[PDB]
Design a protein around this ligand. Structure first.
Ligand SMILES: *[C@@H]1O[C@H](CO)[C@@H](O)[C@H](O)[C@H]1NC(C)=O
Ligand SMILES: *[C@@H]1O[C@H](CO)[C@@H](O)[C@H](O)[C@H]1NC(C)=O
Ligand SMILES: *[C@@H]1O[C@H](CO)[C@@H](O)[C@H](O)[C@H]1NC(C)=O
Ligand SMILES: *[C@@H]1O[C@H](CO)[C@@H](O)[C@H](O)[C@H]1NC(C)=O
Ligand SMILES: *[C@@H]1O[C@H](CO)[C@@H](O)[C@H](O)[C@H]1NC(C)=O
Lengths: 507, 12, 48, 20, 49, 98, 98, 97, 48, 289, 48, 147
């Protein structure tokens, strides 16, 4: 397993087969797989050094770990992009020994530099990922080179975790399972050699090929992405508010000790005692319960303020903050969620230093139909489409049809303030009753950002009490079309900053 | 006489 | 474990009592042991 | 083969925990 | 004891616990016997008589 | 309320499934006029109170689940069903005593 | 095995089998099976028996639904056989449906 | 506090303290079957570098353990490694049991 | 093997419980009995 | 109207409302409601306890335990029934097992000391939808009311062989008059067009008969208004003692006779001539075996 | 397979001997020369 | 199936001397069966007014088949002046039942401030009561206990 932690260095050596035994399409599969792997690894913003060595009858080095540019994602991506399949026409044999000896030469050159006795070299871990069919027909047995690799790093029983050799064969090409198993490192409780069919399965397997368990710093957005993980692992920021043994409103962790939730959950309660926030826990499946010490309600929120004018309910300024009385120990089951208009969101998007949230708004909501997700009652993740631009104008018009609740004309300027986002149109799901406050997030560069929280809607698909899982479907003839809404976080920056200026670092 | 299965190392 | 019938033998000239032993074999986890017990006898003085 | 042989109808061998 | 007659009954132990008010026990039997003693003063009297 | 009138008012607040206004429900009370008066007063009071509560703190578009309150009732009854007893047989010991 | 009291002939009813795991921190891997009965055509036809492998979370229970449509009258037996993996437990429950 | 553990069907392996390299030895894992049902299992040792197994390494031996009984399986092995090895023996039963 | 066991400790005040779990086959391996520290040794220590 | 408090196992909750009145001059001395309930349904005991034990005391007492050899029954002891106005009571019934093609339940009110005065009514929750149509499950249910032939690849030789087997005692070619679909058994009134052979039942051309089919076979039959069909069946498939109704059994054949104007299409000319030849052969030549 | 013979009074005085099938050898075949003792177990090739 | 509900008795006496009758009594009761059993009891058998530690109560829950219960219990105390229960609102607490046993303490200050009486001795003879509501963590099963 490729260990992830804040201490040390991770030298990644990606070897790609470039022989006659792999065709051009298989080489494209290998290249896109390596691109995906190098993209995912850099998402954790750790110290990583990546070296690309496409190998054939002779070993050709495309980028050097010793080179100081190995700590840049775009440079490595561009260097891998310039790989050529025809560069090895003179020699089309598979020479695994050449690649392994090139890796050994790189490692020895690094060892001579900076001094072997220095702890900086001692704390370096290695990970060699070979994408090949394994049929190495010349140059010598891989065992000699592997033993040489072990001896240079003196990989004993105690230091067995400092060298990981993988052998992943992805594509239609025939793969000898025995050879791939022999090439991969032999460890007691994990698999190091795989055979696959496409790149999505490789993404899943690579998601299993890491362990963020040793990482416990306050990083936002980072979360699992494999489909075989628990529902809480995929959305660690999901926390829940329990008034009295009931499971009413959801939330999102925005810091070590803060939670952001809708303000209409705390309608008729000022006794913060007996209120418990359920937070995911690595051990128990029901989570650990925390106590809230300060609940802040937006002063501009008043449901019945426009009652006389004809607006039965107006959900403006529907936002609240919670401060747990105890610090949440970050783990693999609970991590914050990236909020925009802050330094960490800028860092997670790999944007220039001199950025402003005016650019963040366009970067994160450029499309006229931006995909987004929110968490269901049972913990699953659903899909919606936030609509901006001219497409937003048609959205609010549908509310005017619902004159049974507000008899007035109810145009966009009156009921649907600019603070709300569309959803629920065409092939889009709608939240049930009991999902208010749940983050409406979106994924960018393998990192999750929050761009709003559920506020209200026009149809509850959980009215039928079949189960907590079954969800009704709105009939096509259902007179009010489903048209949900979510408070937009960007418009609420003036309220956010003065309440969280010290906790975070806003732009 | 002893009876073996999938052991006899003589081909053909 | 070898357990004598009585922890003593009466060597009084009037009579000599019966000499009977029970040998028990037991796995560490509790279940009994199937096997063959081979026992040998002899005299032993306080010297050794 | 004096008796029958139940080959490849056995457990997966991957679900059997290893005690070490 | 040899030649005795033994009688059994099995109970849930959920009703046995709440039966603390009165149970059939040897102490209760001997107390019932002790309630019919000829003499009642514990250990002494004013005279020899 | 007095001890004897507590039962008359306790059943005056719970809502029957037939959706009957307590003016009509009072016709079924086979007791004195004091019980009828207490029943009617309690029912009207709780009806208005719960109507106000459901008008104020219930929203059809809230998307937040309605608050639930633990009943915290009285008159709790202890367990009374336990598995039946068995082994109702007598035996005489007749083996040679040791 | 949860059954209705009595199911009328030619009525489609979803009987279920609820498996309870009482281990504190262990996860059972049961292989439930529905035996074929001539009276009603279960999802298990005579040619192939119906078997499902289900994993029960610790201190929890899992419900396996089955659909049976009865085309005969009287009292007939509904049997499900469950075998646990690595725990030797082969408990199976048989009930009578009217 | 005595606290006993049990499996009701397990493999027991008892290796010697140490063995000279190139010197043939015999492993005798024993299957214990304390279940109430007569069984049948297949036992094989996972091949590993440094061990010169018999037959190549991947072969398995069919052995049946009656109810409440034990059975040993012999595996001749000559360890040709240098320092140490980690040998694993796997017994797999039928789908019926 | 691998089960989770709930171990309860109870005292009358704050105390430093010194725990230790030992195999039982060690006693069988040992040629001679080696009794552990029990209350008899403590009582002998106090009255010595 | 609202879920409110529901048992964990209960899938859905419904409210059963009963209103009864005595048509006589004076109130009934004592009356009893016997309520027979559908499959998987159980009443909400809290509502019944509130009705009985409460101060109002709408019902004297309720009893959920009886013989009820067929289906679960609830007995409610009414002290009296008011003749002036309807006496109404309602309570909640919960379903624990989901069911399709559910049969109706019965409610019977009778005076105890005079059992002559009783009234019975049936209630059923408000085409039909199933829950198990699959590769094999949809076939065992539909295995009845038909023959094993799929009515798509019917050959002339097979039809001739299976037409008048000694088990078969009547073959008819009729037309559908109307479809009277009901809760438990569907009524199909067939107008007889021509009888190829006659058995123990005598009919004439132009007469009408009625066929009764189970509800589960409604989709398999998929009969239509004003259409022609051919049916042959056993000797004992007559139900009337007057009505002379017939039952679509396991040995009853049903073939949709194409209309005369539609016989000229490609998908119907291949079958119209075969049906005509079969009918003429059995009308004139009879059955060789 | 194996065959051991212990001494009754002193079981530590044993003698273990390997024996083979009615036609095979008593020891696993192995190519041994000086330090290296490469294994030679498996199948033997054919003359194609 | 239909008998008088109360306290039945069994009377036995020798025919010769009917003046001496030996009696044992039982109860008939009505069918009751909760989801699980919960026991609420304090550590002590009383309350001492000048005891600063307060009144500590141990809530215990276990299923009918032996295994323990893990959930949340809502406990509320209350004074009782003869027959009137002046329930204490500030003493409502929420506690987690882990391993199957919980613990809740009523502070002396809360009890003294509940009755707005400056004299602590005035509470002598006013017995307290505890009401607990245990809620399972898996489903929605709820049972109630009192002491
Ligand atoms: C990563 O490398 C940088 C640059 O050498 C160093 O300052 C930093 O401490 C390292 N660790 C982390 C966790 O960023
Ligand atoms: C995910 O789990 C399933 C079984 O639920 C298994 O078949 C599959 O291989 C797993 N996927 C990966 C990528 O390990
Ligand atoms: C994702 O989840 C899997 C399954 O729990 C876990 O083993 C793996 O380490 C995770 N990968 C990450 C967090 O990158
Ligand atoms: C969770 O609920 C959603 C509601 O749409 C459902 O689609 C999904 O299958 C459920 N996921 C589960 C039960 O894992
Ligand atoms: C197992 O083996 C014994 C002989 O060892 C045989 O008699 C028996 O029938 C088998 N089955 C059992 C005990 O169930």
């Amino acid at each position: 397993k490729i260990q992830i932690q804040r201490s040390g260095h991770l030298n990644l050596y990606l070897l790609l087969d470039c022989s006659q035994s792999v065709s051009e399409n298989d080489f494209l599969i290998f290249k896109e797989s390596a691109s995906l792997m190098v993209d995912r690894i850099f998402s954790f913003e750790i110290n990583v050094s990546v070296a690309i060595i496409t190998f054939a009858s002779e070993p050709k080095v495309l980028m050097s770990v010793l080179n100081d540019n190995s700590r840049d994602m775009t440079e490595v991506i561009s260097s891998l992009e310039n790989a050529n399949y025809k560069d090895h026409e003179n020699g089309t044999g598979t020479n695994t020994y050449a690649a392994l000896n090139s890796v050994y030469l790189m490692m020895n050159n690094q060892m001579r530099l900076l001094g072997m006795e220095t702890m900086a070299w001692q704390e370096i871990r290695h990970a060699i990922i070979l994408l090949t069919d394994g049929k190495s027909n010349m140059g010598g047995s891989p065992k000699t080179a592997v033993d040489h690799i072990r001896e240079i790093l003196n990989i004993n029983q105690k230091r067995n975790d400092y060298l990981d050799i993988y052998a992943i064969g992805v594509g239609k090409l025939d793969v000898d399972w025995r050879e791939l198993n022999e090439l991969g490192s032999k460890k007691d409780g994990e698999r190091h050699a795989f055979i696959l069919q496409d790149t999505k399965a490789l993404h899943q397997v690579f998601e299993h090929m890491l362990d963020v368990s040793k990482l416990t710093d306050t990083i936002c957005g980072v979360g699992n992405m494999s489909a075989n993980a628990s529902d809480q692992e995929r959305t660690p920021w999901h926390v829940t508010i329990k008034p009295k043994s009931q499971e009413t409103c959801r939330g999102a962790l925005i810091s070590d000790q803060w939670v952001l939730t809708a303000a209409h959950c705390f309608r008729d309660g000022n006794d913060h005692s007996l209120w418990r926030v359920n937070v995911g826990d690595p051990k128990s499946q029901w989570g650990k319960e925390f106590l809230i010490e300060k609940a802040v309600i937006s002063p501009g929120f008043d449901v019945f303020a426009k009652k006389n004018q004809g607006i039965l309910e107006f959900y403006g300024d529907d936002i609240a903050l919670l401060k747990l009385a105890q610090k949440v120990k970050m783990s693999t089951h609970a991590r914050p969620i990236c909020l925009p208009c802050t330094m960490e969101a800028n860092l997670a998007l790999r944007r220039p230093q001199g950025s402003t949230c005016r650019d963040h708004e366009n970067e994160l909501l450029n499309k006229q139909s931006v995909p987004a997700h929110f968490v269901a009652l049972n913990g699953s993740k659903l899909n919606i489409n936030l609509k901006m631009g001219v497409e937003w104008t048609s959205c609010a018009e549908v509310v005017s049809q619902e004159k049974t609740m507000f008899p007035n004309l109810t145009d966009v300027r009156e009921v649907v303030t600019d603070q709300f986002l569309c959803s629920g149109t065409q092939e889009d799901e709608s939240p049930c009753k009991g999902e208010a406050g749940g983050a409406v997030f979106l994924e960018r560069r393998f990192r999750f950002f929050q761009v709003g929280l559920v506020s209200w809607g026009l149809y509850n698909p959980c009215l039928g009490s079949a189960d907590k899982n079954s969800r009704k479907r709105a009939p096509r003839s259902k007179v009010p079309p489903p048209r949900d809404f979510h408070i937009n976080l960007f418009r609420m920056q003036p309220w956010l900053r003065q309440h969280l200026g010290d906790v975070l670092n806003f732009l | 006489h002893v009876e073996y299965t999938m052991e006899a190392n003589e081909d053909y | 474990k070898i357990t004598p019938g009585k922890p003593y033998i009466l060597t009084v000239p009037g009579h000599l009592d019966e000499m009977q032993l029970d040998i028990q074999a037991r796995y560490i986890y509790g279940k009994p042991v199937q096997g063959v017990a081979y026992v040998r006898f002899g005299l032993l003085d306080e010297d050794g | 083969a004096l008796e029958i042989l139940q080959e490849e109808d056995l457990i997966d061998e991957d679900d059997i925990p290893v005690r070490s | 004891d040899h030649g005795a007659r033994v009688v059994l009954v099995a109970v849930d132990k959920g009703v046995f616990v709440l039966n603390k008010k009165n149970k059939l026990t040897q102490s209760k039997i001997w107390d019932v016997v002790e309630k019919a003693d000829i003499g009642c003063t514990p250990g002494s009297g004013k005279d020899y008589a | 309320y007095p001890k004897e009138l507590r039962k008359c008012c306790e059943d005056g607040m719970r809502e029957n499934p037939m959706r009957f206004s307590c003016q009509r429900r009072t016709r079924f009370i086979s007791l004195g006029e004091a019980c009828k008066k207490v029943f009617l007063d309690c029912c009207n009071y709780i009806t208005e109170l719960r109507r106000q509560h459901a008008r104020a703190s219930h929203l059809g578009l809230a998307r937040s689940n309605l608050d639930e309150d633990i009943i915290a009732e009285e008159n709790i009854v202890s367990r009374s069903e336990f598995p039946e007893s068995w082994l109702w047989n007598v035996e005489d010991l007749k083996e040679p005593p040791k | 095995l949860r059954l209705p009291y009595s199911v009328v002939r030619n009525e489609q009813v979803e009987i279920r089998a609820v498996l309870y795991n009482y281990r504190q921190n262990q996860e059972l891997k049961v292989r439930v099976e529905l035996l074929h009965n001539p009276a009603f055509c279960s999802l298990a036809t005579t040619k192939r028996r119906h078997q499902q492998t289900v994993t029960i979370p610790p201190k929890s229970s899992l419900s396996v639904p089955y659909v049976i449509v009865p085309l005969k009258t009287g009292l007939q037996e509904v049997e499900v056989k469950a075998a646990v993996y690595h725990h030797f437990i082969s408990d199976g429950v048989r009930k009578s449906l009217k | 506090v005595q606290l006993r553990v049990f499996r009701e069907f397990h493999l027991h392996l008892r290796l010697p303290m140490s063995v000279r390299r190139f010197e043939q030895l015999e492993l005798r894992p024993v299957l214990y079957n304390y279940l109430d049902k007569n069984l049948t299992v297949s036992v094989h040792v996972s091949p590993v570098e440094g061990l010169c197994l018999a037959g190549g390494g991947g072969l398995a031996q069919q052995v049946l353990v009656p109810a409440g009984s034990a059975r040993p399986v012999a595996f001749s092995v000559v360890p040709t490694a240098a320092a140490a090895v980690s040998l694993k023996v796997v017994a797999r039963g039928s789908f019926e049991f | 093997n691998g089960e989770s066991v709930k171990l309860h400790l109870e005292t009358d005040s704050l105390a430093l419980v010194a725990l230790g779990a030992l195999d039982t086959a060690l006693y069988a391996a040992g040629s001679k009995s080696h009794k552990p520290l029990n209350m008899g040794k403590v009582f002998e220590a106090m009255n010595s | 109207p609202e879920t409110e408090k529901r048992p964990q196992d209960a899938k859905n909750t419904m409210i059963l409302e009963i209103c009864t009145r005595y048509r006589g001059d004076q109130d009934a001395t004592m009356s009893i409601l016997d309520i027979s309930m559908m499959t998987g349904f159980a009443p909400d005991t809290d509502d019944l306890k509130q009705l009985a034990n409460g101060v109002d005391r709408y019902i004297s007492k309720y009893e959920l335990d009886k013989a009820f050899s067929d289906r679960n029954t609830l007995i409610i002891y009414l002290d009296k029934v008011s003749h002036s106005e309807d006496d109404c009571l309602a309570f909640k019934v919960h379903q624990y097992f989901n069911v399709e093609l559910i049969q109706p339940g019965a409610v019977k009110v009778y005076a105890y000391y005079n059992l002559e005065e009783s009234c019975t009514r049936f209630y059923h929750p408000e085409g039909k939808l199933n829950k198990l149509c699959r590769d094999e499950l949809c076939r065992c249910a539909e295995e009845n009311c038909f023959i094993q032939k799929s009515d798509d690849k019917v050959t002339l030789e097979e039809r001739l062989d299976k037409a008048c087997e000694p088990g078969v005692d009547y073959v008819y070619k009729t037309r559908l008059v109307k479809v009277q679909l009901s809760n438990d058994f569907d009524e199909y009134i067939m107008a007889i067009e021509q009888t190829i052979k006659s058995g123990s039942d005598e009919v004439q051309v132009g007469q009408q008969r009625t066929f009764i089919s189970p509800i589960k076979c409604r989709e398999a039959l998929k009969l239509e208004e004003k259409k022609h069909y051919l049916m042959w069946g056993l000797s004992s498939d007559f139900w009337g003692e007057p009505n002379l109704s017939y039952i679509i059994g396991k040995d009853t054949w049903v073939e949709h006779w194409p209309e005369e104007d539609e016989c000229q299409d490609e998908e119907n000319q291949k079958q119209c001539q075969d049906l005509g030849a079969f009918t003429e052969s059995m009308v004139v030549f009879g059955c060789p075996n | 397979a194996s065959a051991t013979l212990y001494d009754y009074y002193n079981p530590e005085r044993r003698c273990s001997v390997f024996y083979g099938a009615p036609s095979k050898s008593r020891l696993l075949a192995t190519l041994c020369s000086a330090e290296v003792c490469q294994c030679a177990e498996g199948k033997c090739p054919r003359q194609r | 199936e239909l008998v008088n509900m109360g306290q039945w008795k069994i009377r036995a006496y020798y025919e010769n001397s009917p003046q001496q009758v030996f009696s044992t009594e039982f109860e008939v009761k009505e069918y009751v069966l909760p989801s699980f059993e919960v026991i609420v009891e304090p550590t002590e058998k009383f309350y001492y007014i000048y005891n600063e530690k307060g009144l500590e109560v141990t809530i215990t829950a276990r299923f009918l088949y032996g295994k323990k219960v893990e959930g949340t219990a809502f406990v509320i105390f209350g004074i009782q002046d003869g027959e009137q229960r002046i329930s204490l609102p500030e003493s409502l607490k929420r506690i987690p039942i882990e391993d199957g046993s919980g613990e809740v303490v009523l502070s002396r200050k809360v009890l003294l401030d509940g009755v707005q009486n400056l004299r602590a001795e005035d509470l002598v003879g006013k017995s307290l009561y505890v009401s607990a509501t245990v809620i399972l963590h898996s489903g929605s099963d709820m049972v109630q206990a009192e002491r």
